[PDB]
Design a binder for this molecule. Structure first.
Ligand code: CLA
Ligand code: CLA
Ligand code: CLA
Ligand code: CLA
Ligand code: CLA
Ligand code: CLA
Ligand code: CLA
Ligand code: CLA
Ligand code: LHG
Ligand code: RRX
Ligand code: SF4
Ligand code: SF4
Ligand code: SF4
Lengths: 39, 73, 80, 165, 144, 37, 740, 63
């Protein structure tokens, strides 16, 4: 389990998780606030 | 040049004549223009407008200049 | 012929001599390093310019340096 | 107003573009039955189109002869004429987020550098430490000024490698 | 140890021939001849491509350039622990012994060998090219 | 005035672009292949 | 003795290694000090030979890696069947296949991307697919999304089984080397079981499900009222009504009265007039024959009884006066070297994928596949590209064997040795053949371009001017066309309409018609010969000179993948066999790019087109014959004219193809940065960037390094092929879907 | 015992050295009169992958 969590802490895994989180956040924002051109 | 000066709006300047023995009769006709006189290339260099602006008006004027520059070379 | 030069930084590892594929280098007795030996280049006329010697050199900077020079049948490694 | 542009709210080309866009969507909505899922989708796109043209005009965007919104980037013209949500405010929003990422990453590299194997902490991310720095990055701007004023942000030239010259 | 004499009538390893052998250069400029002693018949790889069987005792081969001879010299020494020697032969009959020059392989430090192309300085102590400009020809600060 | 005849191109173009190139190439190739005394 | 031999619990199942990147390598396990380590880790992950010198361990890794691949493929298939059951218009397309466009990908409504959900028909909105799954499912007799959903679940159960098998055969019961070296047994099972049994089983499904279901579909019966497959499998009276011979049962088979099964086992040839595809009765009798042929073939090699052949004996027996020892040593090379097996297998498998593209287009095997031009063009191009890549891979692994597994002690005076001994003769002769083809193939196009530009069309090579007719191909076409009446008496029709005869039209569109071959065809067939000969020249040269050359005599010591031997000897850049594969990829791309362009133009110009009253109007109006004889003709009438669809796709559902068309032109140009530059410049630029990171105390412990020379070449070729192939992909799909 | 102490950290001063203005550890100093007696070990490898080098007493300074 400790080794498994270390594997989940590897650069590629963290990147996939972090980028999936960031992409999701941006998508959801555009899903609830569509066509945002200006502040 | 002596024809372009008369109508610089509608006359297309000729760069030089085309002598290609590989040409076909159609190509000769397609390249014959600018007062005919056989297949020729149109000039895009701008020397016609340049020399006309500087006072050049005749082929004699152009001929003399050519001799002078050849002598300078 | 290519110019091959050995510098005082040489540690006498002999790696360049072992890496050379045309026998341009050899080890000669010396007193400047602990190994008491320094690389020499007495057959540069057979050098082609592969620079394997420089790749084998571990000193920083390189103790053996190759400067590509006049080209010959041997320098171009031509078998014809 | 500026640059000879015109409010999208008063541009005729802006209005024609909205009609043109809705007429394409309507020409397609016909081939489908009213409750058909295709029909529902084309209707939601038509509503989203109507809201966009209205929201953009309400925001006071200016439109060129093309009938398309143009953005004012001069801080002076934007503030004096109500066009700061177009480039100015976005600039300070991005700069905050981008500096946030940079300051946190710098803080991480500095923390892992004092460890046994910094290279290992770069391939295997110390998640707990990374999460801690991620949360503490909100006050980066003040931390960056405090580091700039203590002279701890930069490195001494004598400690930085360079070529022979 | 004395400079060896190349016996040109030495038996050559068993080989049917190839297309990577000597060219006109061998008859006009020069060629190279490697010689070694084998304690047993062993198949080996020709640096010019193809398998060949070394003969018991003396063996002789001719290559177009010195690199090919040294390449075979490397394989025989590293794989079969043999000690080969090669020479450069000119078209006029002249033979020139080449390796090992002093009978001791170059990597092994040997007395008598005099250093050549050695600089009593580190590369970073070389002068700027501006100093070696307008010399007899294009040269490098390292050559001085 | 400094005007060449109509046959000029029928002769100048052949000479310049075919004949002269051949002559130039011939002498040039000879010089390069020549060896220093 | 052929037997099952395995080791128990060979490798422990723990995550300990998962947390230690580079554990498989002695050099990489030390951890990263520079960025090169990251690339090296991924580049050397599946190179087991370089990981360990134990063949048994390598063989066990290969076997389990294959189970992993099989599991990946199963998930891919399950997704396609699932998307056909939940996100498709298959059921509507089954009722109206001539008007409804197949679609199985629906996009979410976000950032305005829902525009990509085009009006495909059937009350459905989605991306039009060109994989041909709808026609395959119709041929198989699928009539409900329930059947597609059930197959999807099956594929996932199979994927789970494949991944289990992979774990079990590596960590629990790992086969020993002796097991893997049972080539005679492996061939007997793969020919008899995998191929023959697979073909027999498929004949079972076709005869009991595909034939009756499709007969009812072609008769006009609604898909809802067609009997379910089991109803046909459990009732003989229904099958007897559709096929009278079923009333006799399997008696005729065991009594040798096979003629009775003539109603479902047929040799019609040609195409079903309703669907435009091959007759399923012909495909059924075919797979039954294939099954019998492969069942016999799988009883040829000796195993645990005296009967059978020994591949080593057969090889050692085939020797002649001109080839020295002959096929001696090959059995040992092909039982101890995976790279040798991969080289031969990749060569044949790629050549096969290319043969599938030609056969599937000329003899369209699925119903309504011929008139779906988008699917037809996609299938031909896709399988052509897969074949070409595999052929280049064959070259690489042949060189890897020559560099890593070749042993002269086992190859003295054998075919392999004699080939290496005349390599200069082979490459030099092939060199001349390449130069001859180049001038006599591409020189003809230049002649035509110059003659047309000089206004001398009568001096051009054309069907009206000087003619270069492909007489041999014209004679073969005539022979195959007249075959049914003399050399193939039983066959009702010729194998394909391409040979000649009447055209078959479905839905008003031409399914297939005769394909005429003239001067323009003769010219483009010789461009193919040139491009293939040249690609072979580079790949072959790389393999024959992998161990040594006149320039470099110890290339084998340098290895297969190495940048060069230094600037010496004039410059030894790209002398490694790997570099030959790098160059071969570009020529393979050039060859296949020309092959697919030829197919698209010829099909759009002379085959595809709407059939009207008294006349067939082709898509490009038959301009291939008078426009494909000049480069200008190709650039203007093909690239410029057919690019209109992709360049005008914005604002529609094909808008994605326009974006990909630009994005692909970008990736291709981005490759030139890596292909024309060197790492020496980048390393120095990085040094100044690293300085800025050092100044602000933001320099990484893992030292940034420019890509290796070999990596630079690998990145360049990858982006070149990605960009170039994607550009043609966007151009082809946008063009075909619009004018299909 | 001339030279820096073993285990001490010194900064390289050789301009053409990859570790110029960088700090390494004194592995050992050759008391015999060698041109470069200070053996220094570095954590970061050079472009050749080497992590050690010999320097003269003047080429090194405690840092
Ligand atoms: C430098 C390049 C660049 C820039 C400046 C933009 C900028 C923008 N794009 Mg865009 N885009 C780009 C490249 C770029 N794009 C490329 C290369 C592509 C092709 C892949 C796209 C494809 C694309 C699409 C499909 C869409 C956009 C959209 C937008 C707008 C949405 C703004 C928003 O999300 O609300 C504001 C978001 C925030 C304020 C959140 C800030 C981030 C964090 C969470 C805030 C934290 C603050 C502390 C915006 C003005 C959307 C649009 O509607 O256009 C008007 C949209 O539909 N882009
Ligand atoms: C970075 C490049 C840049 C450029 C090319 C300009 C260009 C311009 N700015 Mg400016 N501006 C900039 C950056 C820039 N700005 C930044 C970073 C800020 C943040 C402080 C501002 C804040 C600013 C203000 C407050 C104003 C302008 C204004 C203007 C316009 C006239 C200003 C002037 O006379 O000379 C060019 C200006 C600069 C080169 C630098 C900054 C602008 C100075 C400091 C403002 C002085 C304006 C002065 C009152 C002249 C206008 C008189 C009257 C119409 C107000 C002009 C087109 C004026 C304007 O037109 O408003 C309607 C205006 O009042 N800008
Ligand atoms: C801590 C991360 C970090 C930080 C603070 C910086 C900071 C800087 N970089 Mg940089 N860089 C980084 C990472 C980082 N970089 C990485 C990972 C790469 C490899 C792509 C580069 C490649 C790079 C280049 C080629 C250049 C810079 C340059 C610069 C300087 C100019 C401003 C700039 O950002 O340009 C832009 C930098 C980028 C566009 C790179 C984006 C890197 C991502 C966004 C950072 C993410 C870091 C990491 C994943 C976060 C870890 C968080 C931790 C909790 C795990 C600046 C001081 C420029 C310079 O030298 O100017 C003087 C320059 O030319 N960087
Ligand atoms: C750099 C100056 C220059 C250039 C570029 C040209 C170029 C040309 N000249 Mg020309 N010429 C020049 C100076 C030049 N000339 C001068 C100073 C004289 C006076 C002696 C002539 C007298 C001359 C004659 C009589 C003819 C040409 C002709 C031609 C054309 C034939 C091309 C050829 O190779 O055959 C011949 C090239 C030359 C005779 C001149 C050599 C210049 C090359 C290009 C250098 C050609 C386009 C022929 C023509 O008109 O074709 C339609 C022709 O009949 N030239
Ligand atoms: C929970 C189950 C499990 C566990 C704990 C392990 C554990 C271990 N395995 Mg293993 N294995 C498993 C299942 C498992 N395996 C299965 C199901 C298979 C059949 C495929 C294998 C086949 C296998 C082989 C052949 C080998 C190992 C090896 C090992 C050891 C080191 C390698 C390693 O795991 O690093 C982790 C490796 C990875 C995380 C890579 C994941 C590979 C996946 C399948 C690729 C997925 C790619 C994806 C589909 C496409 C990507 C496209 C891109 C665009 C994203 C290690 C102790 C190696 C060994 O014995 O040590 C030398 C060895 O050679 N395993
Ligand atoms: C009837 C006997 C039989 C059958 C059907 C197969 C079938 C297959 N073998 Mg194979 N093999 C056999 C006997 C058989 N083998 C014997 C006797 C030996 C020892 C000499 C080998 C040694 C062997 C090796 C070394 C390899 C294969 C591989 C393969 C696969 C190649 C992929 C492919 O093209 O098919 C397409 C794939 C499919 C059609 C999926 C269907 C596959 C199902 C599971 C059919 C069942 C096959 C299996 C042998 C049945 C027993 C399972 C049981 C133990 C639970 C394939 C599925 C390769 C592989 O790695 O596969 C993982 C491979 O490397 N076999
Ligand atoms: C894999 C290929 C395949 C398969 C699976 C089948 C299967 C079938 N065919 Mg068929 N067929 C095939 C190929 C195939 N065919 C080919 C290639 C041809 C062309 C010559 C034909 C031509 C053909 C004709 C003309 C007919 C069939 C028929 C049949 C069906 C009846 C078979 C029969 O009469 O008794 C066969 C005997 C057996 C299957 C043995 C059964 C043994 C059982 C399953 C073992 C159970 C053991 C277990 C322990 C019991 C315990 C259970 C547990 C719950 C406790 C049957 C479902 C007949 C039909 O359609 O019926 C309507 C028929 O008319 N076939
Ligand atoms: C059954 C097919 C097959 C198999 C089993 C192998 C197996 C192997 N090959 Mg090989 N190869 C094949 C086909 C195959 N190859 C084909 C068809 C070609 C022609 C292109 C090659 C060309 C080739 C070369 C040149 C080399 C190998 C090498 C190797 C060995 C190590 C692989 C490696 O480097 O790991 C790592 C694998 C990767 C890092 C994958 C890289 C990522 C790919 C290339 C990107 C492709 C684009 C991708 C789809 C983009 C996705 C979208 C994107 C936006 C993400 C290995 C044993 C290497 C070797 O033998 O070592 C000396 C080697 O140098 N192969
Ligand atoms: C086709 C070649 C026919 C020749 C042929 O296959 O005959 C086969 C010929 C006879 O072989 P043997 O009977 O001696 O032994 C063959 C055994 O290996 C088992 O078959 O072998 C050769 O010597 C090939 C000659 C090299 C080929 C020389 C030119 C190669 C042609 C290049 C491509 C031309 C297109
Ligand atoms: C703190 C922080 C970091 C930053 C570190 C450092 C040292 C950054 C260096 C900054 C330096 C030296 C800047 C030097 C000059 C900058 C100048 C002269 C500013 C130019 C800006 C101008 C002219 C404004 C233009 C406009 C404004 C008003 C905003 C918009 O309206 C757009 C526009 C162009 C009109 C790290 C480590 C990268 C990590 C991260 C967080
Ligand atoms: S460049 Fe090559 S041939 Fe010359 S000395 Fe160095 S290793 Fe020897
Ligand atoms: S490799 Fe460098 S240090 Fe070693 S002997 Fe050769 S020149 Fe001297
Ligand atoms: S340019 Fe690059 S590939 Fe060519 S010899 Fe030099 S280092 Fe090697």
């Amino acid at each position: 389990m400790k080794d498994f969590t270390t594997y989940l802490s590897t650069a590629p895994v963290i990147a996939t998780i972090w980028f999936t989180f960031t992409a999701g956040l941006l998508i959801e924002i555009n899903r609830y606030f569509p066509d945002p051109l200006v502040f | 040049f002596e024809q372009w000066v008369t109508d610089p709006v509608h006359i297309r300047p000729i760069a030089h004549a085309i002598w290609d023995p590989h040409f076909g009769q159609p190509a000769v006709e397609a390249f014959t223009r600018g007062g005919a006189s056989g297949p020729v290339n149109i000039s895009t260099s701008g020397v016609y407008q340049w020399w006309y602006t500087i006072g050049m008006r005749t082929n004699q004027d152009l001929y003399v200049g050519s001799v002078f520059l050849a002598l300078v070379s | 012929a290519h110019i091959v030069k050995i510098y005082d930084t040489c540690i006498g590892c002999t790696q360049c001599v072992r890496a050379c594929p045309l026998d341009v280098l050899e080890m000669v007795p010396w007193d400047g390093c602990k190994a008491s030996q320094m690389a020499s280049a007495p057959r540069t006329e057979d050098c082609v310019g592969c620079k394997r010697c420089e790749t084998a050199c571990p000193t920083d900077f390189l103790s053996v340096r190759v400067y590509l020079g006049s080209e010959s049948t041997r320098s171009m490694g031509l078998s014809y | 107003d500026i640059a000879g542009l015109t409010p999208c709210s008063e541009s005729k080309a802006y209005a024609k573009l909205e009609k043109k866009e809705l007429k394409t969507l309507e020409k397609r909505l016909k081939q489908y039955e009213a409750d058909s899922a295709p029909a529902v989708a084309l209707k939601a796109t038509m509503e989203r189109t109507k809201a966009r043209f209205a929201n953009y005009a309400k925001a006071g965007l200016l439109c060129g002869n093309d009938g398309l919104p143009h953005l004012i980037a001069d801080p002076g013209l934007a503030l004096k004429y109500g066009h700061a949500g177009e480039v100015f405010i976005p600039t300070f929003g991005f700069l905050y987020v981008a500096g946030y990422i940079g300051y946190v990453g710098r803080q991480y590299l500095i923390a892992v550098k004092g460890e046994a194997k910094p290279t290992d902490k770069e391939i295997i991310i110390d998640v707990p430490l990374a999460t801690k720095l991620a949360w503490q990055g909100a006050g980066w701007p003040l931390a960056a000024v405090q580091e700039l004023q203590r002279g701890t942000l930069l490195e001494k030239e004598e400690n930085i490698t360079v070529s022979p010259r | 140890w004395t400079v060896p004499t190349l016996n040109p009538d030495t038996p050559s390893p068993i080989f049917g021939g190839s297309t990577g052998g000597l060219l006109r250069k061998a008859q006009t400029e020069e060629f190279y001849v490697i010689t070694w002693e084998a304690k047993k018949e062993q198949i080996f790889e020709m640096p010019t491509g193809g398998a060949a069987i070394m003969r018991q005792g003396p063996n002789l081969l001719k290559f177009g350039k010195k690199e090919q001879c040294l390449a075979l010299t490397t394989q025989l020494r590293n794989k079969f622990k043999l000690t080969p020697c090669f020479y450069r032969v000119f078209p006029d009959g002249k033979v020139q012994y080449l390796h090992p020059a002093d009978g001791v392989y170059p990597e092994k430090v040997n007395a008598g060998r005099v250093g050549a192309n050695q600089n009593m300085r580190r590369i970073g102590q070389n002068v700027n090219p501006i100093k070696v400009k307008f010399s007899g020809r294009m040269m490098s600060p390292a050559e001085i | 005035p400094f005007v060449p005849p109509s046959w000029a191109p029928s002769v100048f173009v052949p000479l310049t672009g075919l004949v002269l190139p051949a002559i130039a190439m011939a002498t040039l190739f000879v010089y390069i292949e020549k060896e220093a005394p | 003795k052929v037997k099952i031999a395995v080791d128990r619990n060979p490798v422990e199942t723990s995550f300990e290694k998962w947390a230690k990147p580079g554990h498989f390598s002695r050099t990489l396990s030390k951890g990263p000090n520079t960025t090169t380590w990251i690339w090296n880790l991924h580049a050397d992950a599946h190179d087991f030979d370089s990981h360990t010198s134990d063949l048994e361990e390598i063989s066990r890794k290969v076997f389990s890696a294959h189970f992993g691949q099989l599991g990946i493929i199963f998930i891919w298939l399950s997704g396609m069947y699932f998307h056909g059951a939940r996100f498709s218009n298959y059921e509507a397309w089954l009722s109206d296949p001539t008007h409804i466009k197949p679609s199985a990908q629906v996009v979410w409504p976000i950032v305005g991307q829902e525009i990509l959900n085009g009006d495909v028909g059937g009350g459905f909105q989605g991306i039009q697919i060109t994989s041909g799954f709808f026609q395959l499912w119709r041929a198989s007799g699928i009539t409900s999304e329930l059947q597609l959903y059930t197959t999807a679940i099956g594929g996932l159960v199979m994927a789970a089984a494949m991944f289990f098998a992979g774990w079990f055969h590596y960590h629990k019961a790992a086969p020993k080397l002796e097991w893997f070296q049972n080539v005679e047994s492996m061939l007997n099972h793969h020919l008899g079981g995998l191929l023959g049994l697979g073909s027999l089983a498929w004949a079972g499904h076709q005869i009991h499900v595909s034939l009756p279901v499709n007969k009812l579909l072609d008769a006009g019966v609604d898909p809802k009222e067609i009997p379910l497959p089991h109803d046909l499998l459990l009732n003989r009276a229904i099958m007897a009504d559709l096929y009278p011979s079923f009333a006799k049962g399997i008696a005729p088979f065991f009594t040798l009265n096979w003629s009775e099964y003539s109603d479902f086992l047929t040799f019609k040839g040609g195409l079903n007039p309703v669907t435009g595809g091959l007759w399923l009765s012909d495909t059924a009798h075919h797979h039954v024959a294939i099954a019998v042929l492969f069942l016999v073939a799988g009883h040829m090699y000796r195993t645990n009884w005296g009967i059978g052949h020994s591949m080593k004996e057969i090889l050692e027996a085939h020797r002649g006066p001109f080839t020295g020892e002959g096929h001696v040593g090959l059995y040992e090379i092909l039982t101890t070297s995976w790279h040798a097996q991969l080289a031969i297998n990749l060569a044949l498998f790629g050549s096969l994928s290319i043969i599938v593209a030609h056969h599937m287009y000329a003899m369209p095997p699925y119903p309504y596949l011929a008139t779906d031009y988008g699917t037809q063009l996609s299938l031909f191009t896709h399988h052509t590209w897969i074949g070409g890549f595999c052929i280049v891979g064959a070259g690489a692994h042949a060189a890897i064997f020559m560099v890593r597994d070749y042993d002269p002690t086992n190859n003295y005076n054998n075919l392999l040795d004699r080939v290496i001994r005349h390599r200069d003769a082979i490459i030099s002769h092939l060199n001349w053949v390449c130069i001859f083809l180049g001038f006599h193939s591409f020189g003809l196009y230049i002649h035509n371009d110059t003659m047309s530009a000089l206004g001398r069309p009568q001096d051009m090579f054309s069907d009206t001017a000087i003619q270069l007719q492909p007489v041999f191909a014209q004679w073969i076409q005539n022979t195959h066309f007249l075959a049914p009446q003399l050399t193939a008496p039983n066959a009702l029709a010729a194998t394909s309409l391409t040979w000649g005869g009447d055209l078959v039209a479905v839905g008003g569109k031409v399914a297939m018609m005769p394909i005429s071959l003239g001067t323009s065809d003769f010219m483009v067939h010789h461009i193919h010969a040139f491009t293939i000969h040249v690609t072979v020249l580079i790949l072959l040269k790389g393999v024959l000179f992998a161990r040594s050359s006149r320039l470099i005599p110890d290339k084998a010591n340098l290895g297969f993948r190495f940048p060069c031997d230094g600037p010496g000897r004039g410059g030894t850049c790209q002398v490694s066999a790997w570099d030959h594969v790098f160059l071969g990829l570009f020529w393979m791309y050039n060859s296949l790019s020309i092959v697919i362009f030829h197919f698209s133009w010829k099909m759009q110009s002379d085959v595809w087109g709407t059939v009207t009253a008294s006349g067939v109007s082709h898509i490009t109006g038959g301009n291939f014959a008078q426009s494909a004889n000049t480069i200008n003709g190709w650039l203007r009438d093909f690239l410029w004219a057919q690019s209109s669809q992709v360049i005008q796709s914005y604002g529609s559902a094909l808008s994605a193809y326009g974006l990909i068309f630009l994005g692909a032109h970008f990736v291709w140009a981005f490759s030139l940065m890596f292909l024309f530059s060197g790492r020496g410049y980048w390393q120095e630029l990085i040094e100044s960037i690293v300085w800025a990171h050092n100044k602000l105390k933001v320099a990484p412990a893992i030292q940034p390094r420019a890509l290796s020379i070999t990596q630079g070449r690998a990145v360049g070729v990858a982006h070149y092929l990605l960009g170039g192939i994607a550009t043609t992909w966007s151009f082809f799909l946008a063009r075909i879907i619009s004018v299909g | 015992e001339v030279g820096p102490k073993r285990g001490s950290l010194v900064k390289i001063l050789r301009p053409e050295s990859y570790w110029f203005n960088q700090v390494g550890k004194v592995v050992s100093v050759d008391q015999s009169g060698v041109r470069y007696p200070v053996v220094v070990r570095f954590e970061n490898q050079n472009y050749a992958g080497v992590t050690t080098n010999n320097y003269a007493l003047d080429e090194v300074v405690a840092a």
